[PDB]
């Protein structure tokens, strides 16, 4: 028994003011993947 140490495990966030760095990083990611150039004809 008291010989091995497994690590610690965590999951993703299961959901749940001034925006936190996680939300800002999400907004940066959505800007990078959603920023759009050109016009309707172009």
């Amino acid at each position: 028994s008291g010989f091995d140490d497994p690590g610690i495990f965590y999951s993703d966030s299961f959901g749940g003011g001034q925006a936190r760095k996680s939300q800002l990083q999400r907004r940066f990611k959505e800007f990078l993947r959603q920023y759009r150039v050109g016009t309707d004809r172009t």
């Binding site: 028994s1 091995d4 610690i8 495990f9 999951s11 993703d12 966030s13 749940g16 996680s22």
Partner: protein, 636 residues
């Protein structure tokens, strides 16, 4: 040395296409059906019989037996990875643990993004999500070992040992995976637990709290965490495998899961498990090095000889009119004579039926005191009945007196507090307590036995203890009546020398006297010389039954509650009033009371149980009365 991916493929193949003909010569894929039941949450424990594995891969069995934790893990992984394809329908979410599991799976698929590479610490631990337990039934090719001889060369190996259970703790929640939640993030942290103690986590390691560099303090929770049923048992060597001048050696067995609640103290068990170390951290140790405690990690607990958990001809001999005589004659067939004594002992084994009318319990147990002259097989019969009965305890004289009969409060080891341990009368609860040398028993024990034989409880109001113990045990006592020998110059109740209360508690006080008698002494001596000559009793008309068979028959007779008709009430009443009139009229008779009538009733219900009828008949009453009369025959 070996590739565990190959070994997991090996165990997957074994699980998927091993078959036998267990149900009436029908190939049924023994482990596939169990995998189906496991996938539907209809079965928790899977026992892998290593005999089956050896049938088609003996070196896999040798690998399993030489590093058993590794292969328990490999088999658990193979089962985990096989379960999804054996699922035929949807689990009905039996309990709350299932709700947690399927919420976790739902949320993991919802935010999956499967092509992404996650961190190795960002999934669920395997043991958090199982709901099944995998155990090995060791190969029959491995001989059972002696607890003394399970040593450091067998650490990590699958061993079988046999012993008596002396001490087993209560089932308690041992945490397997600690689950925490955060005050900042909404993720769950998981701490699989291998040590005997753990330090609870403080900060959460979640990705969202590492990005935010917040506090993220995490809170240990029982709700999402995972526990397992856990028992700790001590198990002792059998008397016949202890070396000559020694005492038996104990081993600690850590029982957990579906293997809990099998072994009770006093049971003869055979335990298959892995012999493992527990590191001995903390103790400022005299010797340098990594010293550890050992224990057996249980995999398969099987209750043995008397603790053990029919063909048409079998029911034929049960329905035979001489079944009662054959069973009684199978009682210790190496003791010559004592035919009616063996009938009475058989009735004690079967017992009467308990009555609970309008909140006034009257026991069904039958108590018998053999009070005989020296050397008349009383201790041998007591010892035989102890060997035969399923929950029996044997006590002699004053070697197990006081708290060896009642309970005592003892320091718990698992947590450390004061737990109540039962003595002989508790270990023999709902069984037989064989009390040898009854006449030389300490008076405090005798008073305790008063209460046991009538109320079937033990009340204790000493300092550390204030309890009432259940002691629903038949009492088979043996004594010498007065000064070693029965002398006819003195009455009964003078060479019986039992108070009327204690005397009346016994349903049968059997008197044995060995008066010399030439032809009878020859018959006994021939029997005994044959036994010394062949290590068995001489051949007779009917071969005596095995103790396994005797146990099975007695057990079948046990759940056979027969009733007393209204029609017998006059016959039984007349028998009682008659017995009572000889007691009054005679000048050499013992104390007769209403307990004599209850003795008639419960003896006759035990006879009826032996015929496996549901109604007591006149012949049962007749035989009961004959037994009560024979019990005092030797004084004639």
């Amino acid at each position: 040395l070996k590739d565990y991916a190959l070994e997991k493929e090996k165990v997957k193949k074994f699980l998927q296409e091993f078959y036998q003909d267990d149900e009436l010569g029908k190939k049924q894929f023994k482990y596939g059906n169990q995998l189906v039941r496991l996938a539907h949450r209809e079965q928790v424990a899977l026992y892998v019989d290593l005999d089956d594995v050896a049938e088609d891969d003996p070196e896999l069995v040798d690998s399993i037996c030489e590093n058993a934790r590794r292969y328990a893990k490999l088999f658990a992984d193979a089962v985990q990875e096989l379960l999804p394809q054996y699922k035929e329908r949807e689990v009905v979410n039996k309990d709350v643990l299932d709700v947690y599991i399927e919420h976790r799976l739902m949320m993991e698929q919802r935010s999956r993004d499967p092509g992404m590479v996650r961190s190795p610490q960002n999934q669920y631990p395997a043991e958090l999500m199982r709901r099944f337990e995998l155990y090995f039934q060791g190969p029959s090719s491995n001989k059972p070992r002696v607890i003394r001889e399970v040593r450091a060369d067998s650490v990590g190996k699958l061993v079988t040992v046999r012993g008596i259970v002396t001490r087993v703790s209560e089932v308690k929640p041992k945490m397997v995976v600690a689950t925490y939640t955060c005050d900042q993030c909404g993720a769950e942290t998981y701490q699989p637990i291998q040590s005997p103690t753990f330090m609870p986590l403080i900060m959460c390691p979640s990705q969202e709290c590492q990005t935010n560099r917040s506090g993220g303090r995490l809170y240990l929770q029982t709700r999402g965490s995972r526990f397992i049923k856990f028992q700790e048992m001590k198990m002792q060597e059998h008397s016949d495998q202890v070396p000559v001048g020694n005492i038996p050696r104990s081993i600690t067995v850590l029982v957990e899961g579906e293997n809990t609640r099998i072994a009770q103290p006093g049971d003869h068990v055979s335990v298959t498990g892995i012999f493992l170390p527990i590191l001995r951290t903390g103790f400022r140790q005299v010797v340098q090095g990594l010293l550890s405690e050992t224990y057996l990690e249980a995999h398969r607990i099987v209750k043995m000889n008397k603790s053990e958990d029919l063909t048409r001809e079998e029911l034929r001999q049960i329905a035979e009119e001489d079944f009662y005589e054959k069973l009684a004659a199978s009682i210790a067939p190496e003791i010559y004579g004592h035919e009616d004594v063996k009938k009475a002992l058989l009735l004690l084994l079967v017992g009467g039926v308990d009555q609970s009318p309008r909140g006034m319990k009257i026991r069904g147990n039958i108590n018998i005191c053999l009070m005989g002259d020296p050397g008349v097989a009383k201790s041998q019969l007591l010892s035989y009945i102890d060997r035969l009965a399923p929950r029996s305890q044997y006590t002699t004289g004053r070697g197990s007196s006081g708290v060896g009969l009642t309970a005592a409060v003892l320091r718990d080891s698992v947590s450390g507090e004061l737990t109540l341990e039962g003595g002989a009368l508790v270990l023999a609860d709902q069984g037989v307590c064989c009390i040898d040398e009854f006449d030389k028993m300490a008076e405090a024990d005798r008073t305790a036995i008063h209460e046991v034989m009538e109320q079937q409880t033990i009340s204790i109001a000493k300092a550390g203890i204030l309890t009432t113990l259940n002691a629903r045990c038949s009492i088979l006592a043996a004594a010498n009546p007065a000064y070693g020998r029965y002398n006819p110059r003195r009455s009964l109740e003078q060479n019986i020398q039992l108070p009327a209360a204690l005397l009346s508690r016994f349903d049968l006080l059997w008197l044995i006297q060995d008066r010399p008698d030439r032809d009878n002494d020859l018959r006994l001596a021939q029997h005994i010389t044959y036994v010394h000559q062949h290590s068995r009793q001489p051949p007779s008309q009917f071969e005596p039954l095995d103790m396994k068979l005797m146990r099975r028959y007695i057990a079948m007779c046990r759940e056979k509650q027969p009733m007393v008709p209204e029609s017998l009430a006059d016959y039984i009443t007349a028998a009682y009033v008659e017995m009572r009139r000889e007691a009054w009229a005679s000048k050499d008779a013992t104390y007769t009371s209403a307990r004599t009538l209850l003795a008639i009733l419960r003896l006759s219900t035990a006879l009826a149980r032996l015929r496996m009828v549901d109604v007591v008949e006149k012949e049962d009453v007749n035989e009961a009365i004959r037994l009560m009369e024979m019990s005092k025959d030797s004084l004639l």
